[PDB]
């Protein structure tokens, strides 16, 4: 029932009770109004009460007509008195570890299963129920204002459908997708994912290279962990630095700092182990491995 | 619990309380009745109260037996104080888009599944749970008074069964069916369907005529969509019009009005590209394509 | 919350309030008990109330701890205050037509599906949720006091399990079972069913005998229906009749009455078309076909 | 796939599919091909018998209705279910048979009271059928016609005596 | 609404009512607080009430603002008010009969399914939803303080996994496992199970020894059932008993007490049919069969 109608009904009861008590029992309008509230709220102080048979009958009628009406009115009154984010589509183990590494940022999770809300809310992320392939449910989870969308669905067809829905909503957001099969990497790149991370290809190549001695798997799983002494971080070359035009052979960054320069990236291209005559620019992203003291020394060396 | 039973129960409590207070405490029948209401409503003015141990025990019994009974009674009392339709049998994609275009009217969707209730009520139709093949579940959904019944079920045998049931109920209503296979169009028309729409035959013919260049599919899916500039309208010829007994060569609709006369219809027949010797009659339906200004010019052209 | 726990909680509140008021305010145990009920029910007559600061604090604690507890208790109390039969195990079409023919008798239905309660309650039978193979759920449906149990489950293994459960409960009740396969008839008789009705064997033999002309199927489906002029009823020969020792050749029941005597049964054996020297007894059940006037004439002819 | 299985050359088609809508659809598909073949259907629900007879089936046999009526009538004692289940089996001593009345017989125009079938032959005459109707327990004024079908129960010696008694 | 917010709201109402009554009506702070509770709970004794027009208006405002708030507060409060244990990992038939014999103690059943909650709570155990292979869901169910953990999961690999998890949590608790295959008994004992019970090996040996005559299966299933006359009891030898250093030939337990000495145990070993030169020690466990009178005679026989 609309709140305003309940308001009118309780006002009508109040008028009925007040006028009745005033005329039948002869109390003032103010006392009669007060008595009506005390009665229909079921407070019943008894400072005022009917003393005539007609008043007793009238009071029973007010009790029957008024107590329920007042109760519904108070309960309705109760109601009126009382950088950017990262969106994750689908729930898997990869997204679970990604959500572990994403503490301190605002994370939405768009998943179909209702019985994952406890682990999503315990991991520190807001849960948005919905289908990630549908554009309306994609939209609700604030795909427009995001900075990166992480897609990990059950198959590659649903992943490609989700990527095309996100590209229908926002053509500028970043999509990080996960390939379940090897041959669908180029198709997940054709649909519009900015980077495709295929974990089973990495796992198969590490299991193939770990037959003789497993130093490659130890290296990968150690430098990706933020628990060791050496960390893989990307420093950018700022605008107006001492390194523009200087090659890596003239620089000797490992000699002056002690970081291991394993690659230099520009845009979306990375060259691992660059040759000696590679000329540095402003904007090239240096990918290196070193202790945080060496990282701060490298930041102080390439400064403006 | 039926409202009338709750009424009897509260009356019984009232008799119990009134007689008890009268006999135990010695107050008049009227005062005892008033005290009973004041007590079971939990008002409790205290102008009357038991003064004997037996009366105190009795009052505790009335409190326990009466307060809940009165509460349920007042809430039940609260409740008492405070063209034609279209039936759609089955739920699928075709009936979903048909329901999207059929806004404004009253639509009763008859379906076996109970989980489609929320999407039916969100699309704007009253859901009627039942089996569309049963005759009683058809008569529940008001097939007798409807102006059209749209049948689209899971298989084609279920569609023929529902059409036979509707024809057993009503021999005058308009039935629109959807054929799954090409062989069952004549069986659906013999069973009583006023129009059989075959989506897979239209889709196969458009996919086979869209190999070279697909202007046919563009034409169909643009004149059926009510968002384009041109609309396919049926304009009926009224009785007493200016065009009774003129040929379509002498009438010359297209240059004087701007519409394109693709066909004319009579009864249950349609003549696409009618020849120049076709003499118009009264009651004929003109099927045309044009801008709504041209449609209104054609409507003013064919006036009485 | 279990009703009995709510009972204990409200009793504990009552003890707390009564003892507290007695010791703090010095009223008698009886007055204190009465005051506690009046207070936690929110009646509040005010004939008794605390007059000390400690009593006022105590009363606020009782209000907070007691009003909700009492409210939940009264609502739970509300719930508790507010020939023989035939038990049917399982729900099928055969049991549906059996329940149609069993109007006027008290019928329980024991089935596993919860979403059949509407059609069971509409057909005129009480629904008992449960598994028919389990002895506790068999027991609840009052298998002990029944006169016949009708078993129609999904397979023959479950039917035999249900028959053995019923024979574990009551060794004297009548079990009418239905065979889904032909070879399980003797096994359903070994388990303890008093009569096994195999409908697919009857249907297959009628479909085999209805190739040339279907008079046998018309005869069976017409005399089993209680709508025709002729009815198949069993009259018993009473103790002390005129027919003891008289053969059917000396009787000529079809000559004097007009019923067609197609069989005479004793115990659990039936002889169809009995020979001429078959001597009648007292207790032999005559199976005949005739109009109800002929049935009453046959009852008047074989009288004591 | 119906015209694969030689419905045109057949003498009777027995239609028992998974549901009743499929049965009505298959009956319509049969009546498309041969409009005079004999169709025996099976109704899985009681409401669909008039639809299966309107759609074209010459004989509709509903097993669940027979099973429900034999279940409800066997609460006291099951002589009716025993009769129905024992008269149909082709192993028992008494058999239900259909005996046609030939042209030129001894019973043209003869009433069933003057024919006196049960004492002479021994066959229990439960019905005399003609065309597409069956009259169960016919009255004593019923005069026979050449072309009627006598439906009876008896031992095969009594069946041979009935065939030799009504012979031309 | 969060419970703590409702708490603040009701406290605010209490402050409002108390201060208002104190200032407007001039009663003490304590009386005013008491009056506020009595009023917003709708008790309304009437020992205190407003006597001024302003107080009457104020009281009506408190009634409207306070009664609903107090009602919601009490209902929320309701929710918060309303040897060592044994943990059972997994739910099956073996754990069901084990729970049937383990009445009186505290049992925590850890299971993946949520639908087993009602049958676990009806069998008399506290259900803990979780995964028995996870270490965190094991630590939720209080494995650290328990006196025995019973592991019976779906496969044998899951049982070894849960045993490894419990041994990672606690290195002293008693683990009882159930083997599905004969090959995994040594793997379950190496993984840390204190006792491995293999039901299919016992069942196969009893079914193979029951071909000729099945007295072995009758013996096992009668001495394990606690409804027969004889019970298989373990009677420990206390320190300082009369039987320290006597052989079992010289002790002669069976004729003097009536029990049957089938075996003796020490630590984790058992000697079935011990030879006559076996000298008793202190702390040994005597495994015997007998009537409880003979068991008490044996217990009094081995006293200090």
Helix count of chain A equals 13
CATH overall fold name of the largest domain in chain A: Rossmann fold
Question: What's the structural domain tally of chain A?
Answer: 4
CATH homologous superfamily classification of the largest domain in chain A: NAD(P)-binding Rossmann-like Domain
Largest sheet of chain A: 6 strands, parallel
Strand order of the largest sheet of chain A: 3-2-1-4-5-6
Strand content of chain A: 15-25%
Structural class of chain A: alpha/beta
Largest interface: C-D, 66 and 61 residues
Number of strands of chain A: 10
Radius of gyration of chain A: 35 Å
The CATH architecture of the largest domain in chain A: 3-Layer(aba) Sandwich
- CATH top-level class of the largest domain in chain A: Alpha Beta
End-to-end separation of chain A in angstroms reads 69 Å
Shape label of chain A? elongated
List the secondary-structure elements of chain A in sequence, H or E. Answer: HHHEHEHEHEHEHEHHEHHEEEH
Structure description:
Chain A is of the alpha/beta class and 304 residues long. Chain A folds into four domains: 2-81, Helix Hairpins (Orthogonal Bundle), CATH 1.10.287; 84-198, NAD(P)-binding Rossmann-like Domain (Rossmann fold, 3-Layer(aba) Sandwich), CATH 3.40.50; 199-226, Voltage-gated potassium channel (Single alpha-helices involved in coiled-coils or other helix-helix interfaces); 227-304, Regulator of K+ conductance, C-terminal domain (Alpha-Beta Plaits, 2-Layer Sandwich). In chain A, 48% of the residues lie in helices and 17% in strands. Chain A is built from 13 helices and ten strands. Chain A has helices at residues 3-25, 29-40, 53-81, 93-101, 117-123, 135-140, 156-169, 185-191, 199-209, 215-223, 248-251, 253-256, 292-301; strands at 85-89, 107-111, 126-129, 146-151, 174-178, 195-197, 231-236, 260-266, 269-272, 285-290. Chain A has a six-stranded parallel β-sheet, sandwiched between helices. The first copy, chain A, has a four-stranded antiparallel β-sheet with strand order 7-10-8-9, covered by helices on one side. In chain A, helix 1 (3-25) crosses helix 2 and helix 1 runs antiparallel to helix 3 (53-81). The radius of gyration of chain A is 35 Å and the shape is elongated. The first copy, chain A, starts with a helix and ends with a helix. In chain A, 30% of the residues are buried. Chain D: It is a multi-pass membrane protein. Chain D: One of its GO terms (cellular component) is plasma membrane. Chain D: Homotetramer. Chain D: Calcium-gated potassium channel. Chain D: It is found in: Cell membrane.
């Amino acid at each position: 029932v609309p709140a305003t109608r309940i308001l009118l009904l309780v006002l009508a009861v109040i008028i009925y009770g007040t006028a009745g008590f005033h005329f039948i029992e002869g109390e003032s309008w103010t006392v009669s109004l007060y008595w009506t509230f005390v009665t229909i709220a079921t407070v019943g102080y008894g400072d005022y009460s009917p003393s005539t048979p007609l008043g007793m009958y009238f009071t029973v009628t007010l009790i029957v007509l008024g107590i329920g009406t007042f109760a519904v009115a108070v309960e309705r009154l109760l109601e009126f008195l009382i950088s950017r984010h990262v969106v994750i589509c689908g729930w898997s183990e990869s997204t679970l570890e990604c959500l572990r590494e994403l503490r301190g940022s605002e994370v939405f999770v768009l998943a179909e299963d209702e019985n994952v809300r406890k682990k999503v809310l315990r991991s520190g992320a807001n849960f948005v129920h919905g289908d990630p392939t549908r554009v309306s449910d994609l939209e609700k989870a604030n795909v427009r204002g995001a900075r990166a969308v992480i897609v990990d669905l059950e198959s590659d067809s649903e992943t490609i459908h989700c990527i095309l829905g996100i590209r229908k909503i926002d053509e500028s957001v970043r999509i990080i997708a996960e390939a379940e099969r090897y041959e669908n990497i180029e198709q997940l790149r054709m649909a519009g994912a900015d980077q495709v991370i295929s974990p089973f290809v990495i796992s198969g190549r590490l299991m193939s290279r770990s037959i003789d001695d497993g130093y490659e798997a130890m290296f990968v799983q150690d430098v990706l962990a933020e628990e060791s002494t050496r960390r893989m971080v990307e420093v950018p070359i700022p605008e107006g630095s001492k390194l523009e035009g200087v090659s890596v052979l003239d620089a000797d960054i490992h000699d002056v700092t002690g970081v291991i320069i394993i690659g230099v990236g520009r845009g979306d291209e990375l060259i691992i182990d660059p040759p000696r005559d590679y000329s540095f620019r402003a904007g090239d992203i240096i990918l290196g491995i070193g202790k945080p003291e060496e990282i701060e020394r490298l930041k102080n060396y390439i400064s403006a």
